[PDB]
Amino acid sequence: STECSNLLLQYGSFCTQLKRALTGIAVEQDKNTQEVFAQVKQIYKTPPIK
Amino acid sequence: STECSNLLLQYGSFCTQLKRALTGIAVEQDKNTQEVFAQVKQIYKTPPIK
Amino acid sequence: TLKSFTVEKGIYQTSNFRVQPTESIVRFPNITNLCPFHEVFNATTFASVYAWNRKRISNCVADYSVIYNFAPFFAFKCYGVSPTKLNDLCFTNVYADSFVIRGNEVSQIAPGQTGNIADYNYKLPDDFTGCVIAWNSNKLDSKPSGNYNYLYRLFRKSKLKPFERDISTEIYQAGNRPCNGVAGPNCYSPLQSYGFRPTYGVGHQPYRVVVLSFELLHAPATVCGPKKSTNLVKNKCVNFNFNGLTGTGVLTESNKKFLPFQQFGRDIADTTDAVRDPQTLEILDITPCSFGGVSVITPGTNTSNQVAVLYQGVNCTEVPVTGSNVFQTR
Amino acid sequence: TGVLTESNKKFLPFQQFGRDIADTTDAVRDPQTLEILDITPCSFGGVSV
Amino acid sequence: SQCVNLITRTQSYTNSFTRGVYYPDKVFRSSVLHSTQDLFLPFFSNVTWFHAINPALPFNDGVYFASTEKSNIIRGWIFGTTLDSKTQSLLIVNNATNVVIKVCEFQNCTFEYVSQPFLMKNLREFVFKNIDGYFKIYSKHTPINLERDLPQGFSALEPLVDLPIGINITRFQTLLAAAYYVGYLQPRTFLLKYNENGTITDAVDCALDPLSETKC
Amino acid sequence: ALGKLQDVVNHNAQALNTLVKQLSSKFGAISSVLNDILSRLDKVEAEVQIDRLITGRLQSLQTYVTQQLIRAAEIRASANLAATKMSECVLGQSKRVDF
Amino acid sequence: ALGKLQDVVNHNAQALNTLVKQLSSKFGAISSVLNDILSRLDKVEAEVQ
Amino acid sequence: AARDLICAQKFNGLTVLPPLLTDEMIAQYTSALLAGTITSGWTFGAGAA
Amino acid sequence: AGCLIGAEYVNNSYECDIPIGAGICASYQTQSQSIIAYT
Numbered sequence: 006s007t008e009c010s011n012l013l014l015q016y017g018s019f020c021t022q023l024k025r026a027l028t029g030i031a032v033e034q035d036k037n038t039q040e041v042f043a044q045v046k047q048i049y050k051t052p053p054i055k
Numbered sequence: 056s057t058e059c060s061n062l063l064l065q066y067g068s069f070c071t072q073l074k075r076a077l078t079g080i081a082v083e084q085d086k087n088t089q090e091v092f093a094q095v096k097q098i099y100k101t102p103p104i105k
Numbered sequence: 106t107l108k109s110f111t112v113e114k115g116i117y118q119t120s121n122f123r124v125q126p127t128e129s130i131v132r133f134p135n136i137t138n139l140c141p142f143h144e145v146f147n148a149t150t151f152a153s154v155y156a157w158n159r160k161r162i163s164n165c166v167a168d169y170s171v172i173y174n175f176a177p178f179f180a181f182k183c184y185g186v187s188p189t190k191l192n193d194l195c196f197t198n199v200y201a202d203s204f205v206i207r208g209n210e211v212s213q214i215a216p217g218q219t220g221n222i223a224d225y226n227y228k229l230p231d232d233f234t235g236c237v238i239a240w241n242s243n244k245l246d247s248k249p250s251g252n253y254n255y256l257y258r259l260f261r262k263s264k265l266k267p268f269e270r271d272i273s274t275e276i277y278q279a280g281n282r283p284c285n286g287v288a289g290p291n292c293y294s295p296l297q298s299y300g301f302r303p304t305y306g307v308g309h310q311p312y313r314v315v316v317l318s319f320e321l322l323h324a325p326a327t328v329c330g331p332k333k334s335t336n337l338v339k340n341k342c343v344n345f346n347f348n349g350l351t352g353t354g355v356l357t358e359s360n361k362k363f364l365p366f367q368q369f370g371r372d373i374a375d376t377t378d379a380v381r382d383p384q385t386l387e388i389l390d391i392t393p394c395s396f397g398g399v400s401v402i403t404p405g406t407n408t409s410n411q412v413a414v415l416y417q418g419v420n421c422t423e424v425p426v427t428g429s430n431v432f433q434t435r
Numbered sequence: 436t437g438v439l440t441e442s443n444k445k446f447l448p449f450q451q452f453g454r455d456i457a458d459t460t461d462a463v464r465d466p467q468t469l470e471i472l473d474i475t476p477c478s479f480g481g482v483s484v
Numbered sequence: 485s486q487c488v489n490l491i492t493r494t495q496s497y498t499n500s501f502t503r504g505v506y507y508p509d510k511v512f513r514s515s516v517l518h519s520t521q522d523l524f525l526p527f528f529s530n531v532t533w534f535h536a537i538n539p540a541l542p543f544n545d546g547v548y549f550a551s552t553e554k555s556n557i558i559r560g561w562i563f564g565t566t567l568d569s570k571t572q573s574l575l576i577v578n579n580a581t582n583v584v585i586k587v588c589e590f591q592n593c594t595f596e597y598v599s600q601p602f603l604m605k606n607l608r609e610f611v612f613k614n615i616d617g618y619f620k621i622y623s624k625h626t627p628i629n630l631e632r633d634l635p636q637g638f639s640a641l642e643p644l645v646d647l648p649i650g651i652n653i654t655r656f657q658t659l660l661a662a663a664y665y666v667g668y669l670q671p672r673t674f675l676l677k678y679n680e681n682g683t684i685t686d687a688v689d690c691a692l693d694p695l696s697e698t699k700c
Numbered sequence: 701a702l703g704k705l706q707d708v709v710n711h712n713a714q715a716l717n718t719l720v721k722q723l724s725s726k727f728g729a730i731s732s733v734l735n736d737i738l739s740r741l742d743k744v745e746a747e748v749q750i751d752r753l754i755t756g757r758l759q760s761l762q763t764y765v766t767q768q769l770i771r772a773a774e775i776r777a778s779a780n781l782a783a784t785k786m787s788e789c790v791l792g793q794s795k796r797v798d799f
Numbered sequence: 800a801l802g803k804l805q806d807v808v809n810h811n812a813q814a815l816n817t818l819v820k821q822l823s824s825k826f827g828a829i830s831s832v833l834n835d836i837l838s839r840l841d842k843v844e845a846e847v848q
Numbered sequence: 849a850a851r852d853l854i855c856a857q858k859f860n861g862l863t864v865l866p867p868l869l870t871d872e873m874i875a876q877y878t879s880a881l882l883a884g885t886i887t888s889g890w891t892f893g894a895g896a897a
Numbered sequence: 898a899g900c901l902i903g904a905e906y907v908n909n910s911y912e913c914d915i916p917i918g919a920g921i922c923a924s925y926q927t928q929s930q931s932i933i934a935y936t
């Protein structure tokens with residue numbers, strides 16, 4: 006709706022900082038997974054003898 | 056007040072999620088106390104010699 | 106978007122793409138009759154306020170711009186709608202109530218009012234939608250000897266319900282002795298007459314009041330104004346106007362089991378998912394047109410001005426309506 | 436809406452009302468018999484299942 | 485002639501057994517739990533089983549009506565404050581072949597309406613309501629085995645008619661060997677369940693017991 | 701046994717479901733549908749009702765994002781604990797009691 | 800020495816005291832008392848306040 | 849006549865819930881931990897005392 | 898924490914099934930099944 010968008014433009018930059026907070030959360034989740042699991046520099050494998 | 060309740064019913068589910076947040080805090084406090092103090096499995100007691 | 110003249114290396118959410126609508130369609134029921142507002146507004150005699158008339162208006166095309174030529178009133182005072190938008194959208198039934206009051210009591214013809222007319226003669230509901238039209242009738246309802254043909258009720262045992270009529274003539278019991286049909290001490294007739302004279306003030310002059318009450322869409326529509334219809338188009342992003350319900354989307358054939366009294370289908374977020382076409386009795390699913398987010402992958406502007414575009418959550422065959430290297434990720 | 440009991444509040448002769456911290460009437464003076472009455476809300480609580 | 489012919493009425497009392505549910509609106513909804521505040525017959529309520537082998541029957545906030553007999557007895561219901569002529573009254577008389585809803589507002593006619601669909605080992609459940617000067621009638625026809633007492637199950641009631649009468653409906657009386665169940669509606673909140681096809685298959689009365697209040 | 705990850709899934713489902721269900725609210729306006737407001741009224745009155753709906757939906761969105769920020773802080777603390785346990789339990793032998 | 804637990808008590812007391820004291824504010828209305836608003840005005844204006 | 853802040857908090861809709869473990873049970877847990885630490889050392893934290 | 902209607906208090910002590918208040922829990926047991934309250 007164009008009228009609602011033109012009225013929402015008068016409320017400032019709430020949407021931009023809302024998007025910034027969500028983007029920071031999204032980057033932080035991948036950082037959490039990478040700092041938990043990616044702790045080894047080389048991909049070792051088990052020898053075929055068991 | 057009945058009129059205030061009828062106009063408050065048009066504001067959605069703010070009261071339910073505030074109640075959910077407060078209930079989560081209240082359960083979390085008992086969880087904190089249980090995870091700090093209830094670390095022993097049996098109730099030991101000191102022998103009467105001191 | 107960044108409000109800067111240089112961009113660092115990364116991926117940035119810029120905007121959203123949206124498939125624009127192509128055509129506009131109007132789907133109104135086929136009705137050729139004309140609504141008789143002239144028989145309501147132009148009348149020689151108007152009813153009293155305790156015995157107010159009620160005329161049902163259905164199965165006709167209503168033109169609300171010809172009301173202004175029927176009676177000499179200032180404003181088209183409405184509550185749930187606007188007077189300039191009455192010709193576009195449309196209703197189920199119209200109810201016209203006509204009566205004669207004085208100039209003091211015109212403010213009591215309103216939702217949530219307390220007085221004499223509102224409590225004992227004519228009560229409007231709290232959720233009333235419609236319009237009230239009042240105009241001066243000093244030259245028609247008044248005589249220099251005193252017009253006594255208009256009555257009003259001020260003695261009753263309880264307040265009236267909304268849209269409730271009371272034409273009973275029994276002697277009111279204001280005391281302890283029974284009236285037994287004879288007036289006297291603590292026994293009064295509930296109806297008293299107005300005293301309209303043309304030498305009276307402007308606040309005591311007679312006023313003719315017509316209230317138009319509209320029934321919003323729950324049933325198939327019977328009163329719809331002058332808008333021409335359009336051929337129905339399917340499987341395309343179009344603007345649609347179904348019985349005054351406007352929207353944008355794609356209309357598809359449906360297999361929803363609509364009951365014969367059901368005309369609409371709603372969602373969890375209170376939006377219309379299915380519509381019943383008024384001309385041909387068919388069920389149409391409405392879906393929003395294709396959209397999604399656009400991200401711009403770039404190196405630094407001191408490195409290159411080349412960019413790549415990621416369309417999020419949409420397949421690679423639906424994005425239009427280097428850059429020849431199309432790749433499909435998750 | 437509430438319960439009215441006899442009060443021992445020392446109202447001054449020019450005072451006709453009494454208020455709380457949350458701006459609610461706590462005591463009242465009856466306009467016919469010059470008497471101080473408390474105002475207490477009726478019985479309430481929470482119900483858990 | 486007018487006669488009297490007071491067919492003797494004996495009151496018997498039975499239990500509702502979660503019956504008397506109607507569609508609150510004309511909006512299609514599928515696989516949705518929906519909370520509605522309206523005039524409903526309460527669950528497990530006290531309904532009256534009249535036998536007819538007739539002073540008045542009070543009307544308040546709507547009436548649920550149930551009939552089992554197929555012996556072609558129950559015709560219509562007279563509504564109003566008085567009986568013949570003191571105030572406004574209502575008359576919804578009906579016959580067999582061409583089903584009339586011939587409704588009158590003489591006592592000076594101000595409302596006339598004739599329509600076909602009102603009436604068609606089988607329950608014919610009706611709900612009559614009066615709100616804001618509007619008179620609403622819902623109905624549903626269902627089968628039964630073991631016809632004694634009301635059944636156990638769910639059968640939603642579909643709407644029939646809405647009229648702008650605007651009268652006082654304090655009293656009502658059935659026009660007549662016959663037996664019928666009468667129950668009274670109250671302002672209540674239900675939680676209705678709409679399945680995949682859009683039909684009401686289950687409901688919860690939020691003010692029956694604390695368990696259903698927890699469910700609501 | 702796996703109730704913590706199930707709660708992690710359930711909270712993110714419930715927050716989005718509440719955010720969708722908050723679109724049906726009127727917030728003091730005459731309707732919750734924006735097109736019905738734009739069709740029923742003229743420009744000024746529809747601007748008033750649209751402003752009411754805008755304020756209500758903005759408040760709901762801000763509440764959702766604040767709860768998401770608090771939950772993200774809790775999840776980051778748990779992820780720091782998990783990374784410390786991977787560094788000290790799997791990659792070596794720990795002398796800390798109940799670690 | 801035990802100032803942390805006293806701060807824990809004091810913060811929870813102060814939050815509830817501020818929540819009680821916030822009920823006396825008008826927030827742009829004509830009164831902070833709800834019954835006076837309902838008594839003074841008709842339906843639409845009292846609904847606004 | 850001396851109105852407490854807790855009464856206004858209760859009357860205006862704010863209530864405080866009691867904890868699940870009383871102070872006697874926390875004291876019993878503390879006493880069990882102390883008795884185990886004194887009479888067994890660090891063994892009771894790894895299995896049988 | 899208030900009072901309890903519909904649960905029969907027992908002079909036993911089990912692990913907490915449903916927490917209620919200051920040291921009081923409730924459970925549902927067969928020994929005719931019923932809801933009981935305990936410490």
Ligand SMILES: *[C@@H]1O[C@H](CO)[C@@H](O)[C@H](O)[C@H]1NC(C)=O
Nearest residue numbers: 143144146147148149174175
């Ligand atoms: C009102 O209607 C009558 C009946 O047709 C007509 O004769 C009369 O001219 C109308 N009034 C006006 C002002 O046209």
Ligand SMILES: *[C@@H]1O[C@H](CO)[C@@H](O)[C@H](O)[C@H]1NC(C)=O
Nearest residue numbers: 134135136137383384385386
């Ligand atoms: C309106 O259209 C429908 C289907 O197109 C048709 O069956 C019906 O007869 C039409 N009505 C009139 C009055 O032309």
Ligand SMILES: *[C@@H]1O[C@H](CO)[C@@H](O)[C@H](O)[C@H]1NC(C)=O
Nearest residue numbers: 419420421422423432433434
């Ligand atoms: C979406 O893309 C996949 C692979 O790119 C393709 O197999 C599938 O048919 C596409 N869906 C369409 C075109 O609707």
Ligand SMILES: *[C@@H]1O[C@H](CO)[C@@H](O)[C@H](O)[C@H]1NC(C)=O
Nearest residue numbers: 464465466467468469470471
């Ligand atoms: C009002 O009532 C009180 C108590 O009975 C009495 O003292 C007083 O004189 C009365 N006022 C008048 C004007 O009669």
Ligand SMILES: *[C@@H]1O[C@H](CO)[C@@H](O)[C@H](O)[C@H]1NC(C)=O
Nearest residue numbers: 497498499500528529530531
């Ligand atoms: C209905 O009311 C009658 C009145 O005496 C009572 O005897 C009967 O038990 C009631 N039915 C119930 C509670 O199911």
Ligand SMILES: *[C@@H]1O[C@H](CO)[C@@H](O)[C@H](O)[C@H]1NC(C)=O
Nearest residue numbers: 263265266269651652653654
């Ligand atoms: C009918 O009249 C009675 C008084 O005899 C009144 O109490 C009641 O409210 C009226 N009902 C309606 C629906 O107007």
Ligand SMILES: *[C@@H]1O[C@H](CO)[C@@H](O)[C@H](O)[C@H]1NC(C)=O
Nearest residue numbers: 362678679680681682683685
């Ligand atoms: C919906 O209707 C179809 C056809 O009548 C039926 O096969 C299906 O089981 C129904 N769905 C239900 C009852 O959930």
